[PDB]
Subunit: 297 residues, 4 copies
């Protein structure tokens, strides 16, 4: 067996206040996740704008999530990925030492490493910390794909690598992974197809939508895990529209807009190169979120 | 809505000395019937529709209808074309010769607009009174039937009852059944038969079932009975051969497998189709060794 | 090797009341000849090969042959098919009826292997005496004639002399001529006509030249006399019309432009092709206001 | 004010995990002595992702100093997916004597075209040196549209052009058809000549690390409108140009540089690593057809 982190998980947004991380808003939003049945939170991944945060700010947000989830069942799967292995190992070690329950480690973006290099990148990370490591495959952002072979190899050569967050929109790869290695934890990184991944043996989601609708994603996930597929699918069908529209511009631009429109964050701020959506998409985002029940504080 | 669903087989078309082996063909069809397949699809992509003449195409359909007559098995005839007047012609023949419905592939090569697709299928649908199943396979056609075009066609034409998706895009499958849950979504992609069925898909049109009709049929019927544990287990079992049967363009691998199993007596295509590369020949031969292949 | 190069035109096929307007056809060809076009391509993709009957396809070949007889203008017959027997039949017909050479598209929809592509083309090449030009257009066919396959065919079949490239892959164009500089690379993508020529390409088969035969012909001939600064100038000038002529699937825009120019009687397509949306009709009309369009 | 002609995306030699500063300098003088117009320190080929900001800055300084006293320019790699990082690098490059900056489109976080505009505008407004845009969609996950490129070129005095590494010659035609005043730079060695023949005014080359004399000859022949000669060299280079991307750059070029004895050790920083054995053999075989200049 491996130590694992599964269930409904939220890729937390990082609220900015005057260009700075609004720390108490961050905590409040996490509390709102915990209160709405979310099993784990992911501080500062892609939805958290890890790219534009400093390493020190990145570390602070991880701390905040750990301290907020302390005294609860809610796990903290810290975003610890990088395209430089020495940076990712640094983040993994920090997350380890500061009480994170595990780490999400995105495939190296931009430098397009080979499957061999991907193996060593992750093997390095995993042989540096005690905690569970979730792989993260998102080819549309990184420019590289962790093949099924490499994922399964890493799972079978590293004790603490327990699965992969898939965001490649490739249901065939999901079948491939769980048919050859049924011990790994397949996690959906693509909200629109949450239910299909879960129904094929996936064991959780890391959601953008759950930022806005944590109660609905949590219910979807737990229905699926208890094999109530008809109700899990019902929710996944209801959510399809907003699941898509949260991607009309690059995540996290729409989700942060929605949070702002819902009165869940005080100001709509991004760090460059991220910016507000066009006024057209702004209205489009306002349009879809009006068709859903949105939990308060 | 009258419909055709369940476990369905995209039939291969055996050749002898370059001619349609009508005796082997009918013998292959009843092997499907005996193994619980719900419907057969004569001369589709797998049946090499591209290189059959219109008269051979028509012969295969009639053999399918006649062979299935007296059983419960239905005939969803391959009737597609990239020229609408050709497709309408095929559909009219299919109807007038006892087929239960038609499978109509999206126009290839000429790349019609969505408006052209709608009129293509509206024309086809209005020429017969039997069920019509749309067929989306963008990787072969260079064209996509959008979700909107599919939904409009379904709503506007009484005999269009759904779509065979062979696109590797589970997101579109969610899209389709979330906005129009009344349509019949059919898996045209064997590897992911189960994921499609689990989201409300109502059948498969299979290549693998040429070889393993019993396993494909059991998979489909388990899923239709909401026994997802069993349907998934079989889908996982079938994954290796589901992939290897597409290591080269279908239906080169499936014909190869049927040859190795002794179900057809020569491995013959019509050009530009030909034998697999020998490395893929070896893969197919060694993969199918892990499965039990029923005979006649 | 016998070759057919220079500025070539993929002839549109005008329809009146659902039938091939044979009179309009010859008129459009005369217009091509009078503006310095080196060769014409009857019934390719631009000529709606998919929706023509075999009988009609043959009719259009003969017309171009007759109209060009008496002239120095050669006829490069569109003779492609996704079925090898169909392609060979067209190839032979073309030889017999005076076509100077044949254009042969890579098999669409059924997706043959490189080996299958080799045997497909080898069959065509040896069935006739005239030059054969390969046609690579993966966006429409679903398959790619690899560089190695193109070159192997070039070396093995005396009459296969080059390839019409429509893949937007200038890397591949370098690959071909760096390894086999004797072959005739022909541009099948108007927007990048000039880069193809400047890398040693020896001709174009153009969609735009239907509307602007004088400009395309001038571009190619400037290029061939190594006057690249002039060839680039025309290519730059032509970029707007080149792109807008594919705002919807070719030949929907080029036929629309020809109609707007008053060069054809009606804007008529065979399904699944149809008229452009009103908005794209406007775009095309808008763009061609910038160019001097030659009369009949 | 511009930086054009034959340019080299410098590899970054490593020795015991550290940047071999003196090997780096020696590699640059070798580029200067072979007719290279400018060197690009620490871009993609220079493993910018795995260098620290300190090593990144050190490399720029070395390139600047090594080139001082010569006609050779230093187009400093300064790109980042965080604008405050890119501006930082931009200001460092300016204040330490670089002639301009190469700035990659933000990778991974996938900015909108509006974000790309504000990103580069912020960068262009922070320094007074020339700014070359860099478009490599296959690595960044986003494309700078032709519109955004042309917009930025016009609205900003120092944005002078773009390095295109997208294998899309249609786009190159588009860019120079609507804005011929911009400097289109080839970032794809295999198609250096076609980009030059359509109005491109130079290359930023991976191949020139190994064969600087041949790349600059190709470039200059083309710039002198000797297209017959530029093409022949481009044809001769096609074998090595393609094999240098059999694995992700810069794995093949560093392998080639090592095999040629131009660097001490075949050393990368993870997630980059040595090529496979078969690719190592393919690389070794093709570079046997080329004369590799020494120091
Ligand atoms: N949350 C932590 C900060 C993230 C830093 C960085 N913006 C850039 C990372 C980097 N590897 C740094 C290299 C700097 C020197 N070239 C990169 O730019 O690739 C990213 O990973 O997105
Ligand atoms: N199923 C029996 C008929 C098969 C014929 C054909 N090979 C060719 C189809 C065609 N529309 C024929 C037009 C011939 C005139 N150019 C095509 O080639 O596109 C195909 O449909 O793939
Ligand atoms: Cl670079």
């Amino acid at each position: 067996d491996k130590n694992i982190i599964i269930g409904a998980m939220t890729a937390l947004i990082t609220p900015f206040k005057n260009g700075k991380v609004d720390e108490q808003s961050y905590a409040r939003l996490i509390k709102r996740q915990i209160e709405n049945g979310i099993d784990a939170v992911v501080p500062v991944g892609t939805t958290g704008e890890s790219a534009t945060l400093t390493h020190e700010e990145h570390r602070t947000c991880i701390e905040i999530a750990v301290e907020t989830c302390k005294g609860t069942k809610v796990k903290v799967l810290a975003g610890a990925g990088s395209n430089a292995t020495h940076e990712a190992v640094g983040l993994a070690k920090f997350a380890k030492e500061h009480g994170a329950d595990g780490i999400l480690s995105v495939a190296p973006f931009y430098n397009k490493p080979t499957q061999q290099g991907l193996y060593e990148h992750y093997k390095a990370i995993a042989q540096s910390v005690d905690i569970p490591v979730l792989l993260y495959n998102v080819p549309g952002r990184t420019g590289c794909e962790i093949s099924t072979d490499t994922i399964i190899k890493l799972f079978r050569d590293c004790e603490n690598i327990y699965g992969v967050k898939e965001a490649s929109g490739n249901i065939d790869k999901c079948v491939d992974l769980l048919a050859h290695e049924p011990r790994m934890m397949l996690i959906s990184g693509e909200d629109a197809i949450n239910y299909p991944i879960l129904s094929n043996g996936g064991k959780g989601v890391i959601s953008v939508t759950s930022n806005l609708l944590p109660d609905m994603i949590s219910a979807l996930t737990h229905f699926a895990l208890d094999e109530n597929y008809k109700e899990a699918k019902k929710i996944n069908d209801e959510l399809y529209n907003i699941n898509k529209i949260l991607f009309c511009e690059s995540n996290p631009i729409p989700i942060k807009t929605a949070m702002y429109l819902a009165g869940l964050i005080e100001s709509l701020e991004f760090r460059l190169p991220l910016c507000s959506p066009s006024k057209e998409n702004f209205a489009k985002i306002e349009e879809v979120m009006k068709k859903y029940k949105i939990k308060g504080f």
